[PDB]
């Protein structure tokens, strides 16, 4: 399943050091 | 919140130099055991992860610490589950320790890095072993995303999704995480609760224990006046154990060497039980529990208790030398970087046969269409049927061929 994954990846890229 | 031990065995699989131990450290906190005397028997770590959900948001409710001050709500977290980690090796030579860990497991965690190549030989070999030994509850995790770009990580996801089509598993959750940076761990803890249901496990089933690791507590400086017994790092899948029960280690013992050996299974009584952190009286099946037996600390030193079956008193598991196997072969070999077609089994050839946890070298006596007769050099016990994964010497080190079942 690859539909809520893209929202989790975009959340990860937003919060990075 | 009351202290409770492991409910379900969840393992972690990946590749070498990825950082599987760093992923375990990010989820739970306590570092891996392997990194001389204690713990050392098989290549596996030990760390307990805590799942406490705040239902006073969505994924952030499941927290590492029991006290809730992070998600927003001042109210304390509720008890859901306590899990144990059994980290399996991701190497081509270390195959027997992986298949021993797969029988212990009930759920799996796959790790694929972004920057590296899409079809990895070891992870596909771990996926094949999962399909053989029934471990369908798999969560796919992306290891490193920050090194990769915005579009490249999305293209890597599409190549993983296209790869998982012909396999038995259809609906597996995918999460993007980081081990060193510590992010999105709460989402993984949410998926563990939701996607994995606990299988039915009752008091009725006769007690059986599978020993993986060997603990001996002998301290430098301390005198011989205070000695600790040989603790067995075993896992229970059926039957509830308590303090003060008789145990026999089935396969046998080498204590005396012209003539013949006529020895019984190694008898031992439970002295102490080690679960979670504190001393507990009951042993709930579905977790790694250090059973402190009367057996000597010299026997539980290093490489002696690696894949040995244990039965409770008043029960007789049979010892076999000639085993009847019902084998099925795969199309092409998995584990190699050139992929070659699997040839027919030749008479009299050494094969590493992994019956659950037991590591034995077996020779083929008779070759048929579906069944094969195998002679074992070292004795291995059979209780019910047991899930088996076969491995052969074709190119340098051991390679997986297919699956087998004992018909006895």
Q: Which among B129, B84, B121 has a CA at the least distance from the CA of B102?
A: B129
Distance CA B322, CA B307 (A): 19
Distance CA B388, CA B129 (A): 10
Q: Name residue B83's beta-bridge partners.
A: B49
Other Cβ atoms less than 10 A from the Cβ of B165: the count is 7
N- to C-terminal Cα distance for chain A?
28
Q: Which among B261, B250, B266, B268 has a CA at the least distance from the CA of B319?
A: B250
Q: Select the residue from A1, A6, A7, A17 to test the B interface by mutation, using most B Cβ atoms within 10 A.
A: A1
Q: Which among A11, A2, A8, A3 has a CA at the least distance from the CA of B160?
A: A2
Task: Give the list of residues 6+ apart from residue B169 with CB closer than 8 angstroms, or none.
Answer: B131, B136, B138
> Would you call B184 and A2 a contact, using CB atoms and an 8 Å cutoff?
no
Contact B291, B273 (CB under 8 A): yes
Structure tokens at B25: 């450290």
Strand B138-142 relative to strand B107-112, pairing: parallel
Distance CA B225, CA B172 (A): 54
In B, minimum Cα distance to A10 occurs at B150
B67 labeled binding residue:
no
B142 labeled binding residue:
no
Distance CA B330, CA B334 (A): 9
Q: Out of A1, A8, A13, whose CB is closest to B187?
A: A8
Contact B350, B358 (CB under 8 A): no
- Residues on chain A touching B154 (C-beta within 8 angstroms): 6, 9
> Would you call A12 and B178 a contact, using CB atoms and an 8 Å cutoff?
yes
> Would you call B183 and A12 a contact, using CB atoms and an 8 Å cutoff?
yes
CB of B164 within 8 Å of a chain A CB? The answer is: no
Phi, psi of B30 (to 5 degrees): -75, 135
Domains, in order of start, for chain B: 5-201 (3.40.50.300), 202-316 (2.40.30.10), 317-408 (2.40.30.10)
Distance CA B348, CA B327 (A): 16
CB of B145 within 8 Å of a chain A CB? The answer is: yes
Q: Which residue has the tokens 């795969």?
A: B330
Q: Name residue B363's beta-bridge partners.
A: B350, B375
Distance CA B259, CA B240 (A): 40
Eight-class DSSP state of B355: E
> Would you call B184 and A11 a contact, using CB atoms and an 8 Å cutoff?
yes
- A→B contacts (Cβ < 8 Å), by residue, are 1-2, 5-6, 8-9, 11-13, 15-17
Method: cryo-EM
Distance CA B341, CA B23 (A): 35
Phi, psi of B276 (to 5 degrees): 60, -90
Q: Which residue has the tokens 């490193």?
A: B144
Structure tokens at B39: 């713990």
Q: Which residues of B68-89 are buried (b: 16+ CB within 10 A; e: fewer)?
A: beebeeeeebeebbbbbbbbbb
Contact B327, B182 (CB under 8 A): no
Q: Select the residue from B149, B155, B184, B191 to test the A interface by mutation, using most A Cβ atoms within 10 A.
A: B184
Q: Which residue has the tokens 């145990």?
A: B247
Phi, psi of B102 (to 5 degrees): -70, -30
Task: Give the list of residues 6+ apart from residue B219 with CB closer than 8 angstroms, or none.
Answer: none
CA distances to A13, B92, B118, B150, B255 from B154, rounded to whole Å, are 12, 29, 12, 7, 59
> Would you call A9 and B181 a contact, using CB atoms and an 8 Å cutoff?
no
HSE-CB of B212 using CA atoms within 13 angstroms: 29
In order, the DSSP letters of B52-104 are: EE----TTTTEESSSS--SSS--SPPEEEEEEEEEEPP--SS--HHHHHHHHH
Strand B47-53 relative to strand B78-87, pairing: antiparallel
SS3 state of residue B337: coil
Q: Which residues of B309-340 are buried (b: 16+ CB within 10 A; e: fewer)?
A: bbbeeeeebeebeebebebeebeebbbbeeee
B22 labeled binding residue:
yes
Eight-class DSSP state of B267: E
Distance CA B28, CA B63 (A): 10
CA distances to B25, B51, B373 from B29, rounded to whole Å, are 5, 13, 47
Q: Name residue B366's beta-bridge partners.
A: B373
Structure tokens at B325: 């196997």
* Nearest chain A CA: its distance from B150 CA (Å): 8
**Using CB atoms within 10 A of its CB, is residue B275 exposed (0-12), middle (13-18) or buried (19+)?**
buried
Q: Name residue B112's beta-bridge partners.
A: B142
HSE-CB of B19 using CA atoms within 13 angstroms: 15
In order, the DSSP letters of B192-244 are: HHHH-PPPP--SSSPPEEEEEEEE----SS--TTS----EEEEEEEES-EESS
CB of B173 within 8 Å of a chain A CB? The answer is: yes
Q: Which among B228, B350, B207 has a CA at the least distance from the CA of B285?
A: B207
- Residues on chain B touching A1 (C-beta within 8 angstroms): 171-174
Q: Out of A5, A16, A17, whose CB is closest to B174?
A: A5
> Would you call B184 and A5 a contact, using CB atoms and an 8 Å cutoff?
no
Task: Report the sign of the C-alpha dihedral through residues B50, B53, B59, B63, in that order.
Answer: negative
B144 labeled binding residue:
yes
Distance CA B339, CA B330 (A): 12
B17 labeled binding residue:
yes
Q: Which among B253, B277, B220, B358 has a CA at the least distance from the CA of B29?
A: B277
How many Cβ contacts (< 8 angstroms) between chains A and B?
35
Contact B81, B7 (CB under 8 A): yes
Distance CA B78, CA B185 (A): 18
Q: Which residue has the tokens 């570092």?
A: B31
């Amino acid at each position: 399943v690859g539909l809520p994954y893209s929202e989790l990846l975009s959340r990860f890229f937003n919060i990075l050091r | 919140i009351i202290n409770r031990q492991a409910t379900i065995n969840i393992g972690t699989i990946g590749h070498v130099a990825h950082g599987k131990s760093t992923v375990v450290r990010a989820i739970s906190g306590v570092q891996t055991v392997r990194f001389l005397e204690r713990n050392i028997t098989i290549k596996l770590g030990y760390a307990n992860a805590k799942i406490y959900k705040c239902q006073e948001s969505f994924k952030s409710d499941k927290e590492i610490s029991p006290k809730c001050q992070r998600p927003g709500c001042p109210g304390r977290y509720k008890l859901v589950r306590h899990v144990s980690f059994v980290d399996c090796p991701g190497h081509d030579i270390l195959m027997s320790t992986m298949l021993s860990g797969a029988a212990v497991m009930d759920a799996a965690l796959l790790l694929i890095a972004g920057n590296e190549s899409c079809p990895q030989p070891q992870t596909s070999e771990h996926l094949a072993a999962i399909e053989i030994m029934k471990l369908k509850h798999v969560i796919i995790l992306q290891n490193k995303v920050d090194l990769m770009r915005e579009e490249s990580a999305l293209e890597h996801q599409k190549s993983i999704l296209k790869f998982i089509r012909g396999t038995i598993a259809d609906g597996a959750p995918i999460v993007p995480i980081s081990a060193q940076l510590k992010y999105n761990i709460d989402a993984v803890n949410e998926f563990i609760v939701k996607t994995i249901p606990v299988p039915p496990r009752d008091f009725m089933i006769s007690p059986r224990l599978i020993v993986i690791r060997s603990f001996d507590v002998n301290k430098p400086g301390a005198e011989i006046e205070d000695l600790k017994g040989g603790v067995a790092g075993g896992s229970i899948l059926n039957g509830v154990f308590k303090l003060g029960d008789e145990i026999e280690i089935r396969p046998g013992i080498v204590t005396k060497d012209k003539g013949k050996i006529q020895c019984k299974p190694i008898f031992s009584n439970i002295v102490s039980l080690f679960a979670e952190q504190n001393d507990l009286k009951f042993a709930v099946p579905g977790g790694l529990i250090g059973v402190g037996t009367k057996v000597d600390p010299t026997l539980c030193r290093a490489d002696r208790l690696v894949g040995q079956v244990v039965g409770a008193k008043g029960h007789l598991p049979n010892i076999y030398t000639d085993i009847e196997i019902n084998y099925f072969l795969l199309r092409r070999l998995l584990g190699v970087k050139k992929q070659a077609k699997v040839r027919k089994l030749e008479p009299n050839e050494v094969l590493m046969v992994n019956i659950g946890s037991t590591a034995t070298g077996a020779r083929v006596v008779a070759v048929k269409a579906d069944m094969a007769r195998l002679q074992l050099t070292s004795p291995a016990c059979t209780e019910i049927n047991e899930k088996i994964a076969l491995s052969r010497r074709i190119e340098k080190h051991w390679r997986l061929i297919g699956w087998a079942t004992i018909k006895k």
